Every structure is written in C-alpha cells, then in structure tokens.
Amino acid sequence: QALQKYSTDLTARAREGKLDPVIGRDNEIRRVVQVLSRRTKNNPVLIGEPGVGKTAIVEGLAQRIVAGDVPESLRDKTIVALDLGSMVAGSKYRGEFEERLKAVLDDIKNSAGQIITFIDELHTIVGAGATAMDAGNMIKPMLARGELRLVGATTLDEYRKHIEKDAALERRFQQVYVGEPSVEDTIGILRGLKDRYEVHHGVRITDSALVAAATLSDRYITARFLPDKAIDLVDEAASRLRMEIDSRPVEIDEVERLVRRLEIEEMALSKEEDEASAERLAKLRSELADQKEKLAELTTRWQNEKNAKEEVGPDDIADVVSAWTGIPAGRLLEGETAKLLRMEDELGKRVIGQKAAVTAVSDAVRRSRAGVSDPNRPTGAFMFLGPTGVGKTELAKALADFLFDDERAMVRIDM
Amino acid sequence: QALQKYSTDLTARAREGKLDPVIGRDNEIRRVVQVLSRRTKNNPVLIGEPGVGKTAIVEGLAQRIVAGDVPESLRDKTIVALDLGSMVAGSKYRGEFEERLKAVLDDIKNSAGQIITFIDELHTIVGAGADAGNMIKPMLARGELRLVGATTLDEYRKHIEKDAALERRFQQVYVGEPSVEDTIGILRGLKDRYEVHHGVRITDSALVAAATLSDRYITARFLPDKAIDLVDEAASRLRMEIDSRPVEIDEVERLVRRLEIEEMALSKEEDEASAERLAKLRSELADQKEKLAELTTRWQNEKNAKEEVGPDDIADVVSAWTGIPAGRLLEGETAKLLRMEDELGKRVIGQKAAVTAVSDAVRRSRAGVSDPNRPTGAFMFLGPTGVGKTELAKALADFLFDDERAMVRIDMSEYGEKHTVARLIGAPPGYVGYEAGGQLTEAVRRRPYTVVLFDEIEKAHPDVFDVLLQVLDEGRLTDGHGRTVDFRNTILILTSNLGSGGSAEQVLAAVRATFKPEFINRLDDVLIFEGLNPEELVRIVDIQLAQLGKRLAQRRLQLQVSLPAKRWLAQRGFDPVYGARPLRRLVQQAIGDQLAKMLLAGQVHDGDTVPVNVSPDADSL
Amino acid sequence: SEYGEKHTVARLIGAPPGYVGYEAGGQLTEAVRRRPYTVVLFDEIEKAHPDVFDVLLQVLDEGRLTDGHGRTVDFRNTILILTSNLGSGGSAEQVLAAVRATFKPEFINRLDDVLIFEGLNPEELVRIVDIQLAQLGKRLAQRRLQLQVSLPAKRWLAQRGFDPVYGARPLRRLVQQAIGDQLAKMLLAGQVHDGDTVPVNVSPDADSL
Ligand SMILES: Nc1ncnc2c1ncn2[C@@H]1O[C@H](COP(=O)(O)OP(=O)(O)OP(O)(O)=S)[C@@H](O)[C@H]1O
Ligand SMILES: Nc1ncnc2c1ncn2[C@@H]1O[C@H](COP(=O)(O)OP(=O)(O)OP(O)(O)=S)[C@@H](O)[C@H]1O
Ligand SMILES: Nc1ncnc2c1ncn2[C@@H]1O[C@H](COP(=O)(O)OP(=O)(O)OP(O)(O)=S)[C@@H](O)[C@H]1O
Ligand SMILES: Nc1ncnc2c1ncn2[C@@H]1O[C@H](COP(=O)(O)OP(=O)(O)OP(O)(O)=S)[C@@H](O)[C@H]1O
C-alpha cells in the first residue's frame, strides 16, 4: 500500500484513455520489450537529446500493453511511475527516508514480478538522501537480480554528468539510443496528432499546414529538435485562430488600439499653454485622421467579407515562424511586393550613382523572398571596392535602414 | 536472534540451490580462505573494476563450504549477509541505531566463530551516524568478526582510504578481469541456466562469438558482464520471435496498418496541392502490400518443409546496440555495395581514381578483411579549388546514413594557434571548462560509426597535426576525464588545397615540405584530384538544373530547358582555375534573377511551367 | 602528443587541494599506485612542453613522485620506455646533437643507454612478409579461409614495397591494396564461399588469385 501513496499509475491512465497516441518508433519499443523481458539485469534506459521522444515511447508501451500487442511474458504487468520528490518530502529525522524506500521495495518484491517501475529523468536518483554515501544505492542489490524492472529515461548529457561518474551503477542499466526523426517521419507523426489540438481549439487544420510546419520548423529554428519544434507551430497557430474567432481579428484590433491612444493623447495635449507644442500637435491630428481612415476602410471590407478564415493554412505557420525568430518567412502578401519592386528608387534617396552596385544588392534581396536562392548558403556575400569618399559604407548603412528602419540594428565590426 | 532481523542467510540460500555456478578463479578463492583463517585481522576485501566478478567469488566460496572442499578451519561455518540499510530504518531516537548495532555485534561475538559476516558495498559503512560504523573498529582488529567485503576500485580510495585508521584492518585482494579464453569457459558453464529460463537452445559456436565479438566493439564495459548480455538478449529475442511472427514480417505489417489510415484520412482533403501527395503515398502502400504478401508466402515455403541462437543473433544484437553494423551482408546490402561508385556518381562527377578508393575501403571492411584495430580508412585528397573534394565527403556520408548532417565536421581553419587544441580534447582537471569533456571526443563516444571530416587542414597550426598523429594508425585518444575513445570504425577524411596547379610533383613535394614523414606514413593513399574537362561540365549543368527544379516544387512550379540553353550554360562555364563554382553563379544570374523578377510581378503563378530559350546572347523566359 | 602546454601536467598528477577534479586523483598515478609491476610507455616524448620533462626528473633515478593528494607512489618496479623520432635524417651525429639540443643534460644523464634503431634492409623484409601473411591468415581464419601463398609471390611482395624512407608500413598497405581488394570483391560476389583455400600466384605485374 506504500505504492498507492508514493507513486501514480500509468497503465490505469492508459486504460482510461488519457495518453496521446504514439506513432512510429517500432525498433525502439521492440528493443525495450526484449530488454525488459530477459533473465538478469533487465533495466532499459532510454537515452538521447531532449525533445526527440522518450516519454512518448513509454506511453506507447503502456498503451500497447493495454491493447495486447506484447509477448506472453508482459501480459498484465501494470506499469508504475515512481516519484522521488514526494518521497523525501518530510524526513528530517534519521531513518524516515530509508524506511519509506524499504517499504516500497518490499511491496514491489511481494508482487509476483508484475510491477514495472518507471523513473522519469532517473539522473535524480543518485544523491537521493545525503548527510557519507548511503542512499540511492540501496536498490543496487535488487537491480542485478532483476527483481524490479525500472525502465527510465534521461537526457544525453545528464547521463555522463551524473551517472557515468558512478560506474558501479551504470553497469546495471542498458542504454537505448533514441535518435531524432526526419521530416518525412515528423509529417506522419503530426498526421495522427492532428486531432487532440483540433478538438481542444474549436478549429480545423489543413494537411498543408502540417507539411509546411514540419518543413519550416526544420529549415529555420536550428536550436531545438524535430518532433516538438514542429508541434509548437501548429499549436500556436490554432490558438491564434481561435483567439481571432472572438469578436475581431488582428490588424483591426491593433489599429483601433492605436487610434484610442492617439485620441487620448490629442485630447490632453490640446490644453497646453505653449507655442512650440503647437507644431508638436499639428502632426498628431493629421496622424489620427490618416489612421481613422484606415480603420474605417478595414471595417468596411470586413463587412463585405462577412455578408458575401476558419482553418489554419500553410502561411499562418509562416506568420508564427516570423513572429518568433524574426526572420521574415511569409509569402509576400502584397504589403511589400510594391516595396521590393521600388527598392532601387528607394535606396536612391540616400545613395547616388553606382546603379551597377545598387542593382546587384537589390537582386540578392529580391530573389530570396520569392523563394529561389539556395536555402543553405548565405543570402549574399559581396565585396564592393573602389576609391575613397565614393559611398561604399554609405550603401551598407542605407541597406540596413531600408530593411529594419534602424541603422543601429546591423552588426558592424571594424577589421 | 537479532541476526534474523537485519540479515538473510547466504549459506542457506546456497544450500537450496539458488546461486549460479562459479567457475575458475581458484587463486582468488584460496587467498580469501587463507586470509579468512588467520589469528588476528582475518577479514579480506575484494577489489577491482565493476563487473569482473566479486560477488561471484563469495557465492563460489559459499557453495564450496556447503559441498565441503574447504579446510578444517572452515568446515561447517555459516555465512550471514549483513544489510546495513535495514538497520537505520527506524532509528529517529537518539540511541536506537547504536543499540541495534551493539546487539548485533554482541550476538556475533557470542558464537565461537561459527559466523562469517559478509558486507556487500562496504563503502557505505562509513556513515550511518547522522560515531557510527566506528564501534566496529575494536572488534575488527582482534579477529572476532570475520568480514568479507567487496567494493569497486575507485570508491575505495574515495571513502575508505580517506580513513587510514580503518583501512588498516583490511587485507586487499585484487580481482583482475579474465581473458577471452576464460570468458568462453564461464559461458560454457552458465549456458544451461538460460537454456531453461528461456525455452531455447544456445550453440557453442555462438558462445564463442558472444565473447570474441564483445571484445572489440563494446570497450566502455568490462568482461564477463559485457558478454552475458548478448547471450541473454539474443535468447529473449528468439523467444519473442517464437511466440509471434518473425521480424521483418512484423514491421512491414505495422507500417502497412498505418499507411492505410494515413491515406484514408488524407483522401478527404478538399485541396489541389494535396492531390500530388496522395497519389504518391498511394503508391508506396501498394508497394508495401506487395512484399508483405511475398514474405507471408516465403515463410510458408519454410514452414511446410531458426530454433536456436547462433553466431548471427549475437551479431544482430551487438549491431542494434552501438549502431556498428557487423552482420553477414544479407543479400540486400551486398547488391547495394556492388554498385557503389554508381550511387556516388549521381552526386560527384569525374574523379574516378578517388571514388574507387573511398568506396574500396568499405567493401574490404564489410567482408571482414581489414585490420580489426585501426581506423576503417584514413586518406587525404587534395587538389585545386571547386573540384569536388568537400562534396565527395558528403556524398559518402549520405550513402551510409541517408542524412548529410549525421557526420562530424570540424573546420580546421579556426585552429590557427596551438592553444586551440584544448577545444577538441577537453581541459585538464581543476580548470574552467572541465565538466564538459572534449568536443570531438564526446561526439564519437556516443555514436562510433560516423565519418569525421577535417576540412582545410593545412591552414592550422602544426601541432594539431601532432594531436591527430595517434588518431590515425591506432584509433585512440583520451580526453581530460581520462576516458579513452576508440576510432577503429570511423572513416577519416582530410581535405586540402596545397600545390594549387602543380602537375604532380609541385604538389607531392609541397605536401612533403608542410607535413612530416611520420604523419604522411600513417595515411592511406594520398588522392590527387584533377581539373574539370569541358565535357564533364555539361553534366554538372543537368545536376544544377535538377537541384533548382526540386527546390521549385514547393510551388508546383516547373520549367522546360532547351538543349541550346543547356549547352550554352556549359560553354559559359569558364576559367579552368575556379572549377565548377562559377557555374552556380551563372545559373542564378541568368535564370534565377529574371524568374524572381517575373514571380512577384504577377504574370507567373503556381502550377505554371516556364520554358527557357537562348536569345541571341542571353536567356529569355 | 597532447601534453603541449604547462597546465596539462595536472592531467597525470591530479588537482591541487580544493579544486574541481579532486576526487578523481591523477591519471598516471592512480594506475601505478595499485599493481606496480606494469610497464610505462611515453610515445613521442619530444612532442611535449619542456616542463613535463621535469616530473620525470624525480620519476627517474629516484623512483617516486607525489600526486595532488600528497600521497607518494613508487616506481621502483616499473620499466619506463620513451620513444621519439629525433633527427631521422642524420647518420649518428645529428640524432645525438638534436637530443642534446632538445633535452637537458640532467635529463639525458638519468637514463640508461639511449638506443638507436637502424632501419630495415631488403633482406629483413621477407621475415616481415611471412609475419604479416600469418597474421592476415589468422584474421581470415574465423571463416576457415586460409590462404596458400606461393614463394614467387612472397618474393615479389617483399620486393615491391621496400622504399627506405617509410620503414615497413608501405608493405602493409601493399598487402592490403594487392590481396585484400581482390579477395573482398571475390568474397561478396559469391564464388568464394567458406571453407576454401585460395592460392595466390605471380602474374606479370599484379598477382592474381
Ligand atoms: N513518436 C511520437 N508519437 C507521438 N507523439 C510524439 C512522438 N514523439 C514525440 N511526440 C510528442 O512530442 C512531444 C515530445 O515530448 P516528450 O518526448 O515527452 O519529451 P521528451 O522527449 O521526453 O524530452 P524530455 O527530456 O522528457 S523534456 C510530446 O508532445 C509528445 O506527445
Ligand atoms: N553616392 C553617394 N551618395 C550619397 N552620399 C554620398 C555618396 N558618396 C559619398 N557620400 C557621402 O560621403 C560620406 C562618406 O562616404 P563613405 O562611403 O562613408 O566613405 P567610403 O566610401 O567608405 O570610403 P572609404 O575608403 O571607406 S574612406 C557619406 O557619409 C555620404 O554623406
Ligand atoms: N567466475 C564466474 N563464474 C560464473 N559466473 C560469473 C563469474 N564471474 C562473474 N560471473 C557472472 O557475471 C556477473 C558478474 O556480476 P557480479 O560479479 O555479481 O557483479 P560484480 O562483479 O560484483 O560487480 P559489482 O562491483 O558488484 S557492480 C554475474 O552475472 C555473475 O553470475
Ligand atoms: N565534380 C563535381 N561534381 C558535382 N558538383 C561539383 C563538382 N565539383 C564541384 N562541384 C560543386 O561545387 C560545390 C562544392 O565544391 P567543393 O568541392 O566543396 O569545393 P572544394 O572542392 O572543397 O574546394 P575548396 O578548396 O574547399 S574552395 C558544390 O556546389 C558542388 O555541386
């Protein structure tokens, strides 16, 4: 009965239908099962970089046990998820922790080898109760005889920072290397996960969304790993779309919020007894008017669309990938096609002459938004030289301003 | 009666036949005996690396006592297994643990030496305090309690040797690991205990392989233990196969029962770009439902006319582990190896002398002919620029792993100063970055099958060469933490750009004057690359156009190219001093620029197909 | 060839008290503090930094050194061996001159005889050819595939790879390139199934099986 108090039940939740579906990864679950059913030292440890799916495999094994796809030895085994945090809760006295540990071990042993314990992030088991090495290695006699099974899973570099420093305990563990999947596999994963999200957020999701997410999340976000940085885009897109099925969409709610601030400023700046703030007001009014025009236009266009956007598509994902890691990944939604066609004449406002070099920079900027340049190569690498005072540094500073509206936003180093 | 509460009975467990047969190790047990049977200070301690068998020796001694092979000074003595953990269980009050331990010690002394206390993991005897594990120090030095302990080699000097007053009362017994010939015998003795638990049979030709094979592939662990896992796993897998269908008939069915649902929920997509994906997935499904039904037929051809493990299940296990493929070329891989300079030729063009040398040290290693202790192949190819010598090392890492970014590349141009060596080997203990290991080292210790690439090697400082000096020719280098990492399965590739135009001995003598003979001598053939003839550019043209086309299929947007343009581009591939890089700029100056201009100016939309045609000088879409 | 800086001496001696890697002790020490009958080998001693040379000062001719923990291990039963490649171009004066220029007098004075190796002669390569062939046969004896080499073959093999500037590794690479390639192409293309004894013989330039 100590188990009932110091651990939860995984297989029970698997029966009650509360674990996400698990797709693919057949070799890994096969190896986990065959290691989990050998004579001595049956303790598989899923190891590998963070995010690639290591708890998902154990959940898949649990659902598989509930279904019946397991061999004979693993029929009705009742996986158990330990918890060493709630075990060291209040034990300030001398034996209060070893007592609980002995109780749990005894109740695991009393069962006829049924229980399959599961310690998630087992790199925390090392220094369980310190004071002088005594605790956390009381299970070391039972690991060897294979009484308790203990399928665990830790990240790849907290296994050689915490455990491999304890070569006597690493010996009792078998490593199952979980490498990350490819884009073709991630698409398949998403195709089966595209229902829980689609039901939690009251929306629908096109298959093009899944494809484009699994591709862009690999092309751009080069700091995480694949089964997760692809689910995040889908999830945020769906949440945003549900937020817009509220009263108003974006790009109308932003303009009205701007208009309100401009109004509350123009109403309280009017009663200013000065002469220099007269011109500092003469522009604020014009701005308020030119913004209210846009508000009214958008509001009228919405009415037309509503009398004459309900699922996420392959471009809302681009909006997310642009809002996070501000690389523009869109599809030229008419806001800036005119701008990129005017680029030369616009960079002419600050630089004069050297059309032979302005056109060369503009072409490299242009053929990258249309999706034609090499996706794994810099967006352009020019070295323009010539005599002094001509304008080379000036063109470089004009380009950064035309792109980000702040010449202090580019990275400059003086070689 | 207090020894019943805090300890089990090893000798009784050995009487009912509950312990594994212990084989060999005569000297260790005889020394344990002749230490355990002296006047004072009669308590040994076994010492040695984890896994080499140190509880096995105590269990062997217990079975030996039960049989009666021991001398008169030990005939009819029981061994009790003390359990320090179950003594501090409830002792929150200020003296209860000391009371318990004192009762235990008094009861041990109350007998006349008919008990031999055996403490396992005795490095845990230092604590128990909060003046504990210290009241034992008097009775130790007099020989009252006969203590048999066994801790690993490096927790000894961490918990015990710190207390030279207590480590004086112990006589050390070193337990070195066995050899291959002895491990074979140990397995020959232990086989019939797994033969029962798993309802299978194990072949002696497999017992020899599970010990010869696990001695050149798994170096992070020690002997027998790293050789019993293979046998046990092979047997468990064979039993799984016996119950259900065999493997490679199970996964083919699992993925087929998934592609079904995929295409079923996909066919309901009111979309147009998703029709090219559905009509491509619907072909792999019918292709898999073909070889599945072929396997079910080829299985009955055997089931009408694989029942014990052999030297093949062991190799399959030690291959699923550690990733290293050591199998038997199961007729699907050999057909692929036989045409390798044909699958490499789809990405590298020309350089027949070099493709038939990289590809030549993979076959002669997969067939079991190469030296088992030296890298799979270590050769440097060098020549002029833009020729294809960093591309070959990527067409090769893609043939073997199906992913160009699963290999280990280090750009040796950042190693300009000699102190930049610590970047790939770690920093010695007591310094800033030490709990991080090396950087090249920790990359191979996790997957010892990658293909390392040292790009632009002559730009570095001539000390990193001397670091590499032992990587070649032995496949070993140890980092700060003192962990030896093996390279005996990687493929070492070093690019360069020396010479730059010299025919053959302006370059062969420029290598000789930048490297030392002891470094040139470890290498395999030094491959020389050659410039690009005008003929072998008309084909790179096709490769480039295919690349761009595949890049364009994100919009279902094709393009038709006429042979005049295709041979115009290749004739404007110029200057046999810059190789094949100018062509990739020519393509984007000609086609890509105006395509992108037309693409965001309306007048070209998705699904279209634009034909190129050679205007009298330029290209027109 | 890795001990190239001052601070990499703490790699074989441990760390001074109170620092990061302290419970780990030394690396040369903790393997000669137990079972002190081993053999110590320093490859390419001249690749180091001439401050590692001054730990071997009290290692040699006194037989003890003290790690970080203060313990004193004793080297009174080991056999130290240092290899190098100094000179490599002079007959007998350049090697000694380079040694005297790269080491200290109180370091060359501690050792026993500083031996010189000669360099293999054309006669001394047949006795290596048969060694290599026996080793290779032992390798491809795990499939009962023992070779059967002809005496003209052995003489050609000991005449092709000889060049007196790279020692005896060219012979190994030649054995591989000549025999192993043909054998591996013949082995996985059927026709050389196990339990076979393939003979090798001399063709004009190559040597066909
Ligand atoms: N094969 C898979 N099938 C279904 N969902 C998967 C699969 N692999 C990963 N996921 C999902 O992707 C996410 C991966 O999270 P987890 O794998 O549980 O985290 P992790 O891989 O254990 O990494 P850590 O170390 O636990 S934070 C979860 O949302 C999973 O539901
Ligand atoms: N074509 C031009 N259009 C506009 N301003 C220009 C032009 N050429 C020069 N200038 C002015 O000249 C200033 C200095 O020119 P820079 O380009 O900064 O000097 P530079 O071209 O970098 O030559 P060096 O070799 O670096 S001194 C700029 O800040 C501009 O104000
Ligand atoms: N001489 C031997 N005869 C038979 N089996 C042996 C022998 N030596 C080891 N084994 C087996 O190999 C394994 C070794 O496990 P143990 O020796 O109990 O662990 P250990 O050697 O004590 O290492 P530590 O320090 O306890 S983690 C067990 O399965 C033993 O049954
Ligand atoms: N023989 C070739 N076959 C196919 N592509 C080639 C060939 N030679 C060069 N390339 C192209 O050239 C680029 C790679 O050239 P690399 O070989 O990597 O340059 P390199 O040979 O390393 O010369 P350096 O000294 O490193 S600049 C890719 O875009 C390849 O497509």
Contacts with B170 (C-beta within 8 Å, 6 or more apart), sequence order: B43, B44, B45, B147, B149, B160
Task: Spell out which residues line ligand 2, taking CB within 6 angstroms.
Answer: A 351-353, 388-394
Q: Is there a contact between C47 and B174 if contact means CB atoms under 8 Å apart?
A: no
Question: Which residue among B153, B212, B467 places its CB closest to the CB of C2?
Answer: B467
Q: Which atom of ligand 1 is nearest to the CA of A57?
A: 1
User: What is the number of other CB atoms lying within 10 angstroms of the CB of residue B410?
Assistant: 17
Question: Residue A202 and residue A242: Cα distance in Å, rounded?
Answer: 7
Question: Which residue among B88, B435, B446 places its CB closest to the CB of A98?
Answer: B88
Token reading at B412: 């040796």
- Half-sphere CA count of A198, side-chain side, radius 13 A: 15
Is A54 labelled a binding residue?
yes
* CA angle, B29 then B35 then B41, to 5°: 150
Q: Is B24 in the pocket of ligand 3 (CB under 6 A)?
A: yes
Question: Residue B358 and residue B493: Cα distance in Å, rounded?
Answer: 9
Q: How far is the CA of A351 from the centre of ligand 2 (A)?
A: 9
Ligand minimally distant from the alpha carbon of residue B395: 4
Question: Which residue among B337, B463, B482 places its CB closest to the CB of C4?
Answer: B463
Question: Residue C60 and residue C79: Cα distance in Å, rounded?
Answer: 10
Q: Which atom of ligand 2 is nearest to the CA of A351?
A: 3
- Containing A241, the helix (H) or strand (E) segment is helix A231-244
Question: Residue C131 and residue C154: Cα distance in Å, rounded?
Answer: 11
Question: Residue C209 and residue C207: Cα distance in Å, rounded?
Answer: 7
Q: Do A198 and B269 contact (CB within 8 A), yes or no?
A: no
Instruction: Of B191, B190, B188, B150, give the one whose Cα is nearest residue B171.
Output: B150
Q: Pseudo-torsion of CA B71, B77, B78, B84, nearest 10°?
A: -90
- Containing B380, the helix (H) or strand (E) segment is strand B377-382
Q: Is there a contact between C176 and B370 if contact means CB atoms under 8 Å apart?
A: yes
- Experimental approach taken: cryo-EM
Token reading at B64: 């030996």
Q: Is there a contact between C47 and B157 if contact means CB atoms under 8 Å apart?
A: no
Q: Do B499 and B506 contact (CB within 8 A), yes or no?
A: yes
Of all residues in chain A, the one with the smallest CA distance to B483 is A164
The protein residue with its alpha carbon nearest to ligand 3, atom 17, reads B53
For residue C194, give the amino acid letter.
D
Question: Which residue among B337, B366, B430 places its CB closest to the CB of C21?
Answer: B430
Ligand minimally distant from the alpha carbon of residue B177: 3
Token reading at B315: 């190799």
The alpha-helical segments, DSSP class H, found in B16-54 are 26-36
Supply the DSSP symbol for B525: -
For residue B256, give the amino acid letter.
V
Residue A175 has φ and ψ, to the nearest 5°, of -95, 135
- Containing C74, the helix (H) or strand (E) segment is strand C72-74
The protein residue with its alpha carbon nearest to ligand 3, atom 30, reads B56
Task: Supply the DSSP string of B424-468, one letter for each residue.
Answer: TT---SSSSS-TT--SSHHHHTT-TT--EEEESGGGS-TTHHHHH
Q: Is there a contact between A208 and B271 if contact means CB atoms under 8 Å apart?
A: yes
Q: How far is the CA of A346 from the centre of ligand 2 (A)?
A: 18
Contacts with C96 (C-beta within 8 Å, 6 or more apart), sequence order: none
Q: Which CATH number fits domain B180-320: 3.40.1360.10, 3.40.250.10, 3.40.50.11310, 3.40.50.300?
A: 3.40.50.300
Q: Which partners does chain B have (≥3 C-beta pairs < 8 Å)?
A: A, C
The shares of helix, strand and coil residues in chain B, as percent rounded to the nearest 5, are 45, 10, 45
Question: Residue B427 and residue B438: Cα distance in Å, rounded?
Answer: 7
- Containing B620, the helix (H) or strand (E) segment is strand B619-620
Question: Residue B524 and residue B519: Cα distance in Å, rounded?
Answer: 11
Q: Is there a contact between A134 and B85 if contact means CB atoms under 8 Å apart?
A: yes
- Containing C72, the helix (H) or strand (E) segment is strand C72-74
Q: Is B22 in the pocket of ligand 3 (CB under 6 A)?
A: yes
Resolution in A: 3.5
Task: Spell out which residues line ligand 4, taking CB within 6 angstroms.
Answer: B 348-350, 385-391, 495, 497, 540, 579-581, 584
Three-state DSSP class for A213?
A: helix
Q: Is B182 in the pocket of ligand 3 (CB under 6 A)?
A: no
Taking only residues 146 to 205 of chain A, the set having a beta carbon closer than 8 angstroms to any beta carbon of chain B reads 156, 160-161, 167-168, 171, 174, 177, 182, 188, 191-192
Q: Which partners does chain A have (≥3 C-beta pairs < 8 Å)?
A: B
Using only C-alpha atoms, chain A has a radius of gyration, in whole angstroms, of: 31
Q: Does residue B57 sit at the C interface (CB-CB below 8 Å)?
A: no
- Cα A408 to Cα A346, A393, A404: the distances in Å are 19, 14, 9
Task: Supply the DSSP string of A90-130, one letter for each residue.
Answer: S--SSSHHHHHHHHHHHHHHHSSS--EEE-BTGGGSTTSS-
Question: Residue A312 and residue A202: Cα distance in Å, rounded?
Answer: 11
Instruction: Enumerate the residues of chain C whose CB falls inside 8 A of the CB of residue B518.
Output: 85
State in Å, rounded, how far the first CA of chain C is from the last one.
42
**Considering Cα of B237, then B242, then B246, then B250, what sign does the dihedral take?**
negative
Contacts with A272 (C-beta within 8 Å, 6 or more apart), sequence order: A281
Q: Do B582 and B575 contact (CB within 8 A), yes or no?
A: yes
How buried is residue B593: exposed, middle or buried, by Cβ count under 10 Å (0-12/13-18/19+)?
Answer: middle
Question: Which residue among A31, A95, A372 places its CB closest to the CB of B88?
Answer: A95
* CA angle, B34 then B35 then B36, to 5°: 95
Q: Is there a contact between A206 and B92 if contact means CB atoms under 8 Å apart?
A: no
The shares of helix, strand and coil residues in chain C, as percent rounded to the nearest 5, are 35, 10, 55
User: What is the number of other CB atoms lying within 10 angstroms of the CB of residue A141?
Assistant: 16
Supply the DSSP symbol for A185: H
Smallest CA–CA distance, residue B477 to chain C, in Å, is 9
- Cα B457 to Cα A241, B174, B381, B421: the distances in Å are 52, 46, 11, 14
Question: Residue A149 and residue A78: Cα distance in Å, rounded?
Answer: 12
Token reading at B226: 């790293």
